[PDB]
PDB file of C-alpha atoms and ligand atoms in Angstrom:
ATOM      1  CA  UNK A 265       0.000   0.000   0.000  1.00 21.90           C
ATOM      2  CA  UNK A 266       1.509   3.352  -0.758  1.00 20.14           C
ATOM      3  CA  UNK A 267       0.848   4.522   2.775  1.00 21.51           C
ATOM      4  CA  UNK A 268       3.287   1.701   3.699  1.00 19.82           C
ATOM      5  CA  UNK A 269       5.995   3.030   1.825  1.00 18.35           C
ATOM      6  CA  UNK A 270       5.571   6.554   3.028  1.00 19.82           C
ATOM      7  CA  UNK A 271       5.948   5.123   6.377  1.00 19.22           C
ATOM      8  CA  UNK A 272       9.589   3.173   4.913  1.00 21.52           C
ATOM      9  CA  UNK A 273      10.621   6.780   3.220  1.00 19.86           C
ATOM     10  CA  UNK A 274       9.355   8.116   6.902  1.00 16.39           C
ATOM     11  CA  UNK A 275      12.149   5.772   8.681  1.00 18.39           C
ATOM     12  CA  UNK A 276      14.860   6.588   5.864  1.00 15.89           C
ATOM     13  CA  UNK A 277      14.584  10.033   6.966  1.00 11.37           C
ATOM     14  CA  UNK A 278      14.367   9.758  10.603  1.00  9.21           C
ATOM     15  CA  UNK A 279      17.112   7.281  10.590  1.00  9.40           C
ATOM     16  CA  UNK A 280      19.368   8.882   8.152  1.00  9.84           C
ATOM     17  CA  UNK A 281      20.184   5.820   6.400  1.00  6.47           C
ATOM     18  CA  UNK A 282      18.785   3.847   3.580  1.00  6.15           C
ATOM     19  CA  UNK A 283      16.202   1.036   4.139  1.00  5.67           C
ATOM     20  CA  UNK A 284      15.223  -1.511   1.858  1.00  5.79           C
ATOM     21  CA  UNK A 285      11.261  -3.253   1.807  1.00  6.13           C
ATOM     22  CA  UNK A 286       9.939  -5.588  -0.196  1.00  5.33           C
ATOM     23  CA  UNK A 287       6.120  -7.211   0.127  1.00  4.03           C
ATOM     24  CA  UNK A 288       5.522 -10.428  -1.646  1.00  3.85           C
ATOM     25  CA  UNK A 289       2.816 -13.108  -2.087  1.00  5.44           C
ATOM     26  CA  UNK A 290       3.210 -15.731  -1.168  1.00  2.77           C
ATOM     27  CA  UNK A 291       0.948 -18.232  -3.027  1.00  2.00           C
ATOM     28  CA  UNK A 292       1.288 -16.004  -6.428  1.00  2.00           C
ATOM     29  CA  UNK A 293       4.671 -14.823  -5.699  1.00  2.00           C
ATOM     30  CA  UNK A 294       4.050 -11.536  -6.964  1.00  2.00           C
ATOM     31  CA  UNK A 295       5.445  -8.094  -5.507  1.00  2.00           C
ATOM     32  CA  UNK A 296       2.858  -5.667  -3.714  1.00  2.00           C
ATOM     33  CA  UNK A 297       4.918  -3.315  -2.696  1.00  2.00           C
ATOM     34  CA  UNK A 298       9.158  -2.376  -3.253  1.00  2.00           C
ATOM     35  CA  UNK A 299      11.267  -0.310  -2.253  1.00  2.00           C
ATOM     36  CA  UNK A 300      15.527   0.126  -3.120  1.00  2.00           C
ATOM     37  CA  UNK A 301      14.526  -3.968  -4.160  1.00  2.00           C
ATOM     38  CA  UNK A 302      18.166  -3.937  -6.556  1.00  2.00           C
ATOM     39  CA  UNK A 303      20.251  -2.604  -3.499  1.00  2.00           C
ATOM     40  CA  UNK A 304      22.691  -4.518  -1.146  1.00  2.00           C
ATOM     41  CA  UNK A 305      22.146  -4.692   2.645  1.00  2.00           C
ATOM     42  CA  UNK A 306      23.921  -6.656   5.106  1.00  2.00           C
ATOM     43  CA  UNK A 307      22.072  -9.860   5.698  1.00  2.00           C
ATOM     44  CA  UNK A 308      23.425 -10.154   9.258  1.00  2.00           C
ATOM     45  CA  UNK A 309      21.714 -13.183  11.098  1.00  2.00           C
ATOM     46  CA  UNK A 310      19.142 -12.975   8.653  1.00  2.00           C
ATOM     47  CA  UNK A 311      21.584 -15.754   6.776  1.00  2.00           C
ATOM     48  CA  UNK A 312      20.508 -17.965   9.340  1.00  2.00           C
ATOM     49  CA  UNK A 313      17.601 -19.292   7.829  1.00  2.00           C
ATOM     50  CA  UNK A 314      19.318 -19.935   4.542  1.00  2.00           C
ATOM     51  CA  UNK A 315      21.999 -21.425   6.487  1.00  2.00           C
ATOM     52  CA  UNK A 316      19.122 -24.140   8.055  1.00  2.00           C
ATOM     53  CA  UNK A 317      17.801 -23.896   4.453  1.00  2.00           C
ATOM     54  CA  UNK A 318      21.101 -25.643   3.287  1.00  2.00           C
ATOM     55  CA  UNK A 319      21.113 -27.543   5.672  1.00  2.00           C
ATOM     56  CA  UNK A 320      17.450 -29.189   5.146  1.00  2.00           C
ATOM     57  CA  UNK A 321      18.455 -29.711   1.676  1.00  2.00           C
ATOM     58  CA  UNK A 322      21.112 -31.832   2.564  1.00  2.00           C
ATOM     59  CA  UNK A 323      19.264 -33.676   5.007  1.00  2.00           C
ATOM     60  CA  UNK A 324      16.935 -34.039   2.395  1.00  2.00           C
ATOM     61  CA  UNK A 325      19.676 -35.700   0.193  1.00  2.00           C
ATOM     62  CA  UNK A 326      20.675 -37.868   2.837  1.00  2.00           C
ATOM     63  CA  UNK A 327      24.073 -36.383   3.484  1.00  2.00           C
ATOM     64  CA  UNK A 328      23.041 -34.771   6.635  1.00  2.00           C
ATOM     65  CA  UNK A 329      20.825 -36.291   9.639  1.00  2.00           C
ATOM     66  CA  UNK A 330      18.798 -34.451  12.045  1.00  2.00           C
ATOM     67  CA  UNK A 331      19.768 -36.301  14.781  1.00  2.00           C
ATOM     68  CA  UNK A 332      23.488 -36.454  14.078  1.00  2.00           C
ATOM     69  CA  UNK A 333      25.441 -35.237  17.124  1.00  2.00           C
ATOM     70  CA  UNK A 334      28.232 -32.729  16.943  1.00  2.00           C
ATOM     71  CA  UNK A 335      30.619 -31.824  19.982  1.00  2.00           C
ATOM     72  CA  UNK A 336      33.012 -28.808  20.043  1.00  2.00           C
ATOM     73  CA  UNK A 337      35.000 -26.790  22.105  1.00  2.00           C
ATOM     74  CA  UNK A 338      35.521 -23.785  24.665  1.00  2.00           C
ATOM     75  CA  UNK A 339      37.570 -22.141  21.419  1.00  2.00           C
ATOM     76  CA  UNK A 340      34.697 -22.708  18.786  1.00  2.00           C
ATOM     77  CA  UNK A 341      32.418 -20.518  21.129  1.00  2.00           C
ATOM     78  CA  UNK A 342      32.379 -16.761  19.711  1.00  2.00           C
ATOM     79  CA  UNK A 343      30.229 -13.745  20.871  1.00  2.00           C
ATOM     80  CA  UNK A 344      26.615 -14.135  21.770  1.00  2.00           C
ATOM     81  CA  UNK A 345      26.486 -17.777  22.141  1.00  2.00           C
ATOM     82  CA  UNK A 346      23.758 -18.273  24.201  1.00  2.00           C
ATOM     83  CA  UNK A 347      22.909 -22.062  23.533  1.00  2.00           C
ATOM     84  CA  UNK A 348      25.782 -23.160  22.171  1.00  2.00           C
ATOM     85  CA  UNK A 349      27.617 -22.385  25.494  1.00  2.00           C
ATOM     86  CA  UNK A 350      25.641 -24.302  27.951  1.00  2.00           C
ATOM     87  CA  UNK A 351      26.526 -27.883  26.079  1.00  2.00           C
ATOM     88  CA  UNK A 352      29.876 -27.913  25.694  1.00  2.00           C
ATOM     89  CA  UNK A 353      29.704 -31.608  27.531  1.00  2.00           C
ATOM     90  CA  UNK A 354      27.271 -33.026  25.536  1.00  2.00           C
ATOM     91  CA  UNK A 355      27.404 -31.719  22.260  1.00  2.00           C
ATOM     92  CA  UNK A 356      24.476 -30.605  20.163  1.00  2.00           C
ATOM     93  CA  UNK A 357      22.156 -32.555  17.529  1.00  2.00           C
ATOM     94  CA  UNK A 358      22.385 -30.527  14.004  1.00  2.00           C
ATOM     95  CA  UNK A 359      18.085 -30.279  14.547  1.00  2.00           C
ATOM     96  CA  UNK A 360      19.599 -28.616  18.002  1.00  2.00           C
ATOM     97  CA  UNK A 361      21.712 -26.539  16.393  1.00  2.00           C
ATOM     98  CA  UNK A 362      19.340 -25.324  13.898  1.00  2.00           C
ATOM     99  CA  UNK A 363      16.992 -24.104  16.216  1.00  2.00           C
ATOM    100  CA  UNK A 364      19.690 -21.964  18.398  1.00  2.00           C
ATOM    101  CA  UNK A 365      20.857 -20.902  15.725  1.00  2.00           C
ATOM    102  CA  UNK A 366      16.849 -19.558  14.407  1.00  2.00           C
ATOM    103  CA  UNK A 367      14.923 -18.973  17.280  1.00  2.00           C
ATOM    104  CA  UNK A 368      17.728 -17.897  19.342  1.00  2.00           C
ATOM    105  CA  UNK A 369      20.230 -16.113  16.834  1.00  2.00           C
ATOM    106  CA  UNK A 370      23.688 -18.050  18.257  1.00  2.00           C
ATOM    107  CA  UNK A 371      26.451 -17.253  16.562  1.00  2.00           C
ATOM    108  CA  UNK A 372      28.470 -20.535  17.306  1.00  2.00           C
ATOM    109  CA  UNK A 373      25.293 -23.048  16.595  1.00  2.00           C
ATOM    110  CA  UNK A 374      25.135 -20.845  12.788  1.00  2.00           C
ATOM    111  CA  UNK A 375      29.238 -21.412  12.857  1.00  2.00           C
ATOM    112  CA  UNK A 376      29.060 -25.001  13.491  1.00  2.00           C
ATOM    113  CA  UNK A 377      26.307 -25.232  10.790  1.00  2.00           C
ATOM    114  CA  UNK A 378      28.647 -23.469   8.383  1.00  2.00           C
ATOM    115  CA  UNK A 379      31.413 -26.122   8.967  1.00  2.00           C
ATOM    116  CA  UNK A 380      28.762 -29.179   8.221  1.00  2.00           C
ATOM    117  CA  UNK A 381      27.784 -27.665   4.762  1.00  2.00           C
ATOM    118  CA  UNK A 382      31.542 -26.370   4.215  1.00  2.00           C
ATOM    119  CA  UNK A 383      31.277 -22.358   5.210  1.00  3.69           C
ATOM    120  CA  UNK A 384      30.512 -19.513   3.245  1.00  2.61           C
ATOM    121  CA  UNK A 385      31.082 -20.095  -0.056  1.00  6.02           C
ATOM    122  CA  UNK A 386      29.317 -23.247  -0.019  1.00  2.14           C
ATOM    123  CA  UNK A 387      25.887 -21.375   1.017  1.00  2.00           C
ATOM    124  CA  UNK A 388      26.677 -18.948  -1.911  1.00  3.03           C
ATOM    125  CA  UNK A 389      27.007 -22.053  -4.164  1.00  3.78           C
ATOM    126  CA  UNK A 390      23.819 -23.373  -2.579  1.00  2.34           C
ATOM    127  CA  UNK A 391      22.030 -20.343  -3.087  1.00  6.24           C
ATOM    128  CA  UNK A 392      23.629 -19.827  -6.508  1.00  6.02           C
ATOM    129  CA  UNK A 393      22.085 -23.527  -7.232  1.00  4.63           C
ATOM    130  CA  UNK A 394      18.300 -22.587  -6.692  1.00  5.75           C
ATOM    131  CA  UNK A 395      18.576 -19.693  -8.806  1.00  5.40           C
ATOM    132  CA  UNK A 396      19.591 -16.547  -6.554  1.00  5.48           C
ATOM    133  CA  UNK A 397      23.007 -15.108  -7.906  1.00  8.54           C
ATOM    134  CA  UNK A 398      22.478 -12.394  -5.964  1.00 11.16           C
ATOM    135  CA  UNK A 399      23.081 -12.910  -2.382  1.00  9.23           C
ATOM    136  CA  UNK A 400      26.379 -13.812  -0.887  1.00  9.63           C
ATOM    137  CA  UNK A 401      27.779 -14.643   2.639  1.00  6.38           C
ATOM    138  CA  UNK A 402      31.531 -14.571   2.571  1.00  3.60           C
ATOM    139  CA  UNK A 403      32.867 -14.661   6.726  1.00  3.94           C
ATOM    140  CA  UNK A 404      31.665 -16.234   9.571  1.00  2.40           C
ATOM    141  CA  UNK A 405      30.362 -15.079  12.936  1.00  2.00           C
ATOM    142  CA  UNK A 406      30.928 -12.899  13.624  1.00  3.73           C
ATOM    143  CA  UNK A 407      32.589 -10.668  11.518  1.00  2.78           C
ATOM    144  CA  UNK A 408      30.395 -11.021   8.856  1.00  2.00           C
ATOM    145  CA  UNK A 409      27.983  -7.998  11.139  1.00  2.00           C
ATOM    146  CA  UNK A 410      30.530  -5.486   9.730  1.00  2.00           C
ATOM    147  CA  UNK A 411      28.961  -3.784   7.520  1.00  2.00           C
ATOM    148  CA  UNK A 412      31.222  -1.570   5.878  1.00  2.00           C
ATOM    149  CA  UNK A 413      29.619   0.671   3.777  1.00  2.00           C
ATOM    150  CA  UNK A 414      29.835  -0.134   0.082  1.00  2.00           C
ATOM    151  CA  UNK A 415      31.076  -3.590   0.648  1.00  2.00           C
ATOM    152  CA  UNK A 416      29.322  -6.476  -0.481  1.00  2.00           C
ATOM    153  CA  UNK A 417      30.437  -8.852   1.525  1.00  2.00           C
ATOM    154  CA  UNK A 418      27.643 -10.915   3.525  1.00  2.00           C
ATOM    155  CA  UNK A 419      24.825  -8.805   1.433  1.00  2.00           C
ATOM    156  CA  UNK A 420      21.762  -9.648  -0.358  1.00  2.00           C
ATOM    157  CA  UNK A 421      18.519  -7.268  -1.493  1.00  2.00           C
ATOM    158  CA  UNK A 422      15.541  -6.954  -0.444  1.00  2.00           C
ATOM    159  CA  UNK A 423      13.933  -8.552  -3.481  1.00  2.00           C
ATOM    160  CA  UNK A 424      16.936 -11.300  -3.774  1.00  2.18           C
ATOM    161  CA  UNK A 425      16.262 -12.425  -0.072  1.00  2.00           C
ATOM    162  CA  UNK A 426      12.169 -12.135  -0.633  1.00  2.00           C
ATOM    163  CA  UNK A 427      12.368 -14.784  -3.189  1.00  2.00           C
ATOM    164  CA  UNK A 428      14.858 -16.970  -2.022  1.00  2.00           C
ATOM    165  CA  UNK A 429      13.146 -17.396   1.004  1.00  2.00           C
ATOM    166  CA  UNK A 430       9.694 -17.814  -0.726  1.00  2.00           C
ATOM    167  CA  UNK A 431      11.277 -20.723  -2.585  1.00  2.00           C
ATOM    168  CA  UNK A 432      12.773 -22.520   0.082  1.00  2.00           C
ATOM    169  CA  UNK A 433       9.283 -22.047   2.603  1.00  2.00           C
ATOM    170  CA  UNK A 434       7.027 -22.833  -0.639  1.00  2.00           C
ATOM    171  CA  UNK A 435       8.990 -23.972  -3.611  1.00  2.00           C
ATOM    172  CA  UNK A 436      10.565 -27.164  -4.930  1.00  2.00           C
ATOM    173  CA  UNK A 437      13.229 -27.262  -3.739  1.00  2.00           C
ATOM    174  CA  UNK A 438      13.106 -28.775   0.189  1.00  2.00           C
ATOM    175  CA  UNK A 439      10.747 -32.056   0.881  1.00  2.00           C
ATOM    176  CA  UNK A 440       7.395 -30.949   2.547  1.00  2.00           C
ATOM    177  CA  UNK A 441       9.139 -32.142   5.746  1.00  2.00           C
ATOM    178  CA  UNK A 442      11.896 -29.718   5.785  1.00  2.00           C
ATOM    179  CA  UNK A 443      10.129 -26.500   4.447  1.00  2.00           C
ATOM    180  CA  UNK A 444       7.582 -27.515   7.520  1.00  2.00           C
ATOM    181  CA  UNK A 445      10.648 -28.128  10.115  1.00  2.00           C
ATOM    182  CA  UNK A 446      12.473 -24.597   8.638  1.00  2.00           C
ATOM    183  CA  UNK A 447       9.054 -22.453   9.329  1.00  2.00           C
ATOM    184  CA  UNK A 448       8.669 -23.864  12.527  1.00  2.00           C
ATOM    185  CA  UNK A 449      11.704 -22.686  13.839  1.00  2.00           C
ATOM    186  CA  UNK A 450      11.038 -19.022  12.784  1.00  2.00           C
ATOM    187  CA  UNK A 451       7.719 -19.516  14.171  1.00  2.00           C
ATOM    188  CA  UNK A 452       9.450 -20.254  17.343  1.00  2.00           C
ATOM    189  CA  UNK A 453      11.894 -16.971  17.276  1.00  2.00           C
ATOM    190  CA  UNK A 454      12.528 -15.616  20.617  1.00  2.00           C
ATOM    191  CA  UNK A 455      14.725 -12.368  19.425  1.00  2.00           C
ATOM    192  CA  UNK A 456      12.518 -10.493  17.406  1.00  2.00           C
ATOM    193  CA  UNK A 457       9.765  -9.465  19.889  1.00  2.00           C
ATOM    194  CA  UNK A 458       9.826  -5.843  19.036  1.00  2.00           C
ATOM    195  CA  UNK A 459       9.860  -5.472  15.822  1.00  2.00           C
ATOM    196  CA  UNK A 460       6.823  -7.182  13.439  1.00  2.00           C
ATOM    197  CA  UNK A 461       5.429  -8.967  16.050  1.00  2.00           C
ATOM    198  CA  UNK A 462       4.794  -5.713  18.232  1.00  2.00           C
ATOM    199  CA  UNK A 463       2.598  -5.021  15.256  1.00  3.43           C
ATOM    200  CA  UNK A 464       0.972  -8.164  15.173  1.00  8.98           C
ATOM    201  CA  UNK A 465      -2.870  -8.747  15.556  1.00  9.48           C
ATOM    202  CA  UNK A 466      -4.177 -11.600  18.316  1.00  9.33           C
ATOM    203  CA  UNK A 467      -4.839 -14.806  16.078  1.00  9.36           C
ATOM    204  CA  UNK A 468      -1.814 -13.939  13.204  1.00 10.15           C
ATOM    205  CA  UNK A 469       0.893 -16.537  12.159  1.00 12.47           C
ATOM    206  CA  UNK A 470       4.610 -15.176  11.934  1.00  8.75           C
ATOM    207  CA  UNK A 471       7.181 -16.872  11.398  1.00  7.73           C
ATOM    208  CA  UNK A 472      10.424 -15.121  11.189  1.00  6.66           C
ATOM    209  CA  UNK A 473      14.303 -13.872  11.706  1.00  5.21           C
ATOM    210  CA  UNK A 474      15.739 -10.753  12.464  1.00  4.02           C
ATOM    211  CA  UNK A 475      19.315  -9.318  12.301  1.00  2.00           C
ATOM    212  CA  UNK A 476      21.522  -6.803  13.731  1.00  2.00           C
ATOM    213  CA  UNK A 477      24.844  -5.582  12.916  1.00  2.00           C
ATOM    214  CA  UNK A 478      27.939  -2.479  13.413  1.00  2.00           C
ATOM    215  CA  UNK A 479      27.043   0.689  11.620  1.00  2.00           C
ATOM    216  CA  UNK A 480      23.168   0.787  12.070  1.00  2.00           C
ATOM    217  CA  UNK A 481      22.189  -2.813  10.752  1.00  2.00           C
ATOM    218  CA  UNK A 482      19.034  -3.972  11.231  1.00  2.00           C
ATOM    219  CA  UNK A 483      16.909  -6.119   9.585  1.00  2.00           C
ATOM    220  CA  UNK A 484      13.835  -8.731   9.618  1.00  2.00           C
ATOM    221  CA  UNK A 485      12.518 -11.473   7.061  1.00  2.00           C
ATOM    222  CA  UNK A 486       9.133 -12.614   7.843  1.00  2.00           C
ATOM    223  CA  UNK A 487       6.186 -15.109   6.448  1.00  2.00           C
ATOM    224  CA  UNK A 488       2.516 -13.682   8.241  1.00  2.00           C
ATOM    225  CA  UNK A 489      -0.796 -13.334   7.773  1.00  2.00           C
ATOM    226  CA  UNK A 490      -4.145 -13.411   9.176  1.00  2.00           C
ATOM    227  CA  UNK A 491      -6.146 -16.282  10.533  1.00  2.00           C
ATOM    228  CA  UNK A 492      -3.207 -18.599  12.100  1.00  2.00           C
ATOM    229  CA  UNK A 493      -2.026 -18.744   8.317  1.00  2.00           C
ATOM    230  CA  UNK A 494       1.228 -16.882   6.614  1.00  2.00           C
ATOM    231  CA  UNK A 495      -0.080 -15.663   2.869  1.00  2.00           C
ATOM    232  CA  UNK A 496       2.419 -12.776   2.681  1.00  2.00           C
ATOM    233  CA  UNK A 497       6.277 -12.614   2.922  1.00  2.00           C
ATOM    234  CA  UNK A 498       7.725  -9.160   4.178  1.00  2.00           C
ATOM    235  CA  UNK A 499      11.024  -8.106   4.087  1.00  2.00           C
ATOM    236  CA  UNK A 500      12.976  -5.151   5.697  1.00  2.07           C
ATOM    237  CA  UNK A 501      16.487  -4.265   5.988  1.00  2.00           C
ATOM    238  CA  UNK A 502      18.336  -0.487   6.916  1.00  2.00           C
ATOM    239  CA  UNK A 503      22.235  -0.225   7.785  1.00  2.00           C
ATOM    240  CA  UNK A 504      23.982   3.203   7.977  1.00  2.00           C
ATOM    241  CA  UNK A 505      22.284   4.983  10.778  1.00  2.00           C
ATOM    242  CA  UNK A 506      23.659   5.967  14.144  1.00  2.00           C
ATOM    243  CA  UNK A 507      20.187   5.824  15.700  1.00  2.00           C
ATOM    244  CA  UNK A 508      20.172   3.831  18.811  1.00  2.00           C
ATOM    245  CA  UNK A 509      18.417   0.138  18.696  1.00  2.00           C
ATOM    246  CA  UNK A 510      15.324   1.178  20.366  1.00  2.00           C
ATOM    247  CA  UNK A 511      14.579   3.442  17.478  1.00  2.58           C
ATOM    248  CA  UNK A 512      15.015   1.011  14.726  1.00  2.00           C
ATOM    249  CA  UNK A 513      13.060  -1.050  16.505  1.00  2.00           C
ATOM    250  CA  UNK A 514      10.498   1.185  16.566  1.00  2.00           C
ATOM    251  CA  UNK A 515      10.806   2.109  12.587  1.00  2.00           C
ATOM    252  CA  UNK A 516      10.501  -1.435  11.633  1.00  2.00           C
ATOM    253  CA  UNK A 517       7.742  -1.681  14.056  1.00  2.00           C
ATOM    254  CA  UNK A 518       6.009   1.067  12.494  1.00  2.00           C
ATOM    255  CA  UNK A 519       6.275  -0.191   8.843  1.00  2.94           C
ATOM    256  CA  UNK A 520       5.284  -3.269  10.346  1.00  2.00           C
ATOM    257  CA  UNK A 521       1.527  -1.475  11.729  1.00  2.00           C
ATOM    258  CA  UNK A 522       0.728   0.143   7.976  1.00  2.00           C
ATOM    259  CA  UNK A 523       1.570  -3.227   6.502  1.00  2.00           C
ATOM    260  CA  UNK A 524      -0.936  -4.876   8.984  1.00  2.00           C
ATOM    261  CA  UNK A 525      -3.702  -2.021   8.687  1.00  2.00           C
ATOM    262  CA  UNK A 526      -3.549  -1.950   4.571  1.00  2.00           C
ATOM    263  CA  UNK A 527      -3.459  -5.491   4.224  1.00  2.00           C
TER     264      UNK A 527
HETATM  265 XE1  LIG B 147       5.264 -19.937   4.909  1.00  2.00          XE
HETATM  266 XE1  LIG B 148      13.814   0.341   9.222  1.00  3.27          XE
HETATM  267 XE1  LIG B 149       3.282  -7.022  11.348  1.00  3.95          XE
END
């Protein structure tokens, strides 16, 4: 709705810093609304559900189980590591893993995920395989927050990221049984309360995955809708401001209401 995107050119200005927005359908897959779709962003943890996207796919394939365990060390455990660092004993199942790394954000569960599939440029060759040559993550947690500005490293678009993650929660290419497993876990995020769910009408699915990174990153990929169902993708990504947290919170929030009362 065009009020929508007054309300992203609203949070460009009042963060100082550019913000990308795309709106897609998700049965049809067409775009409803856009906005910078052709620019770069850091993806920040964001990746994480392509990450667990790879990773379904090669569980699919049989070259990954669910249920495999993995055990690592003291020195594998980088910042924010809030899952990772309470089983250092008794290693974690790559289902285990999977969900930290979603619903939680941890760095070292989305590092030791990276390993399995074989790091950063195997993503980008998995992504690159089901038709996005757009996106690319290139370092690990967690210097791949950065964000630099002009560098693409660790970047996508708005309308790259939209579609990619339409395809692997609706399209071909995961078994019915992973692209249910990979929503449920952004169903079940716990670190994106106040941003589209503040937003979010009593009786609405979401399922979804924010990000944060250095220089003003923040970001949020989402599958909602009304009626306990998701029907529309959303995404939203801004880096470049020095606003504090709170108040890009509070923008994506924002976009988030107009989205909700023009649907
Ligand atoms: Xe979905
Ligand atoms: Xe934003
Ligand atoms: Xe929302």
């Amino acid at each position: 709705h065009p009020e929508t995107l007054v309300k992203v050119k609203d949070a460009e200005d009042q963060l100082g810093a550019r913000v990308g927005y795309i709106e897609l359908d998700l049965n049809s897959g067409k775009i409803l609304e856009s906005f910078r779709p052709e620019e770069r962003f850091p993806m920040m943890s964001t990746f994480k559900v392509l990450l667990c996207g790879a990773v379904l796919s090669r569980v699919d394939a049989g070259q990954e189980q669910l249920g495999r365990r993995i055990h690592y060390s003291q020195n594998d455990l980088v910042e924010y590591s809030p899952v990772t660092e309470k089983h250092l004993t008794d290693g974690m199942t790559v289902r285990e893993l999977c969900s930290a790394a979603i619903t939680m954000s941890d760095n070292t569960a989305a590092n030791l995920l990276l390993t399995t599939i074989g790091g950063p440029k195997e993503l980008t060759a998995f992504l690159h395989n089901m038709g996005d040559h757009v996106t690319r993550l290139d370092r690990w947690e967690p210097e791949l927050n950065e964000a630099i500005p002009n560098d693409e490293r660790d970047t996508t678009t708005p309308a790259a990221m939209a579609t990619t993650l339409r395809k692997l929660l609706t399209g071909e290419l995961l078994t019915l049984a992973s692209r249910q497993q990979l929503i449920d876990w952004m169903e079940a995020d716990k670190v994106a309360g106040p941003l589209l769910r503040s937003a979010l009408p009593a009786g609405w699915f979401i399922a979804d995955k924010s990000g944060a990174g250095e220089r003003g990153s923040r970001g949020i990929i989402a599958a909602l809708g009304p009626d306990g169902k998701p029907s529309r993708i959303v995404v939203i990504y801004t880096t470049g401001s020095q606003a504090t947290m709170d108040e890009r919170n509070r923008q994506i929030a924002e976009i988030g209401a107009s989205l909700i009362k023009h649907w």
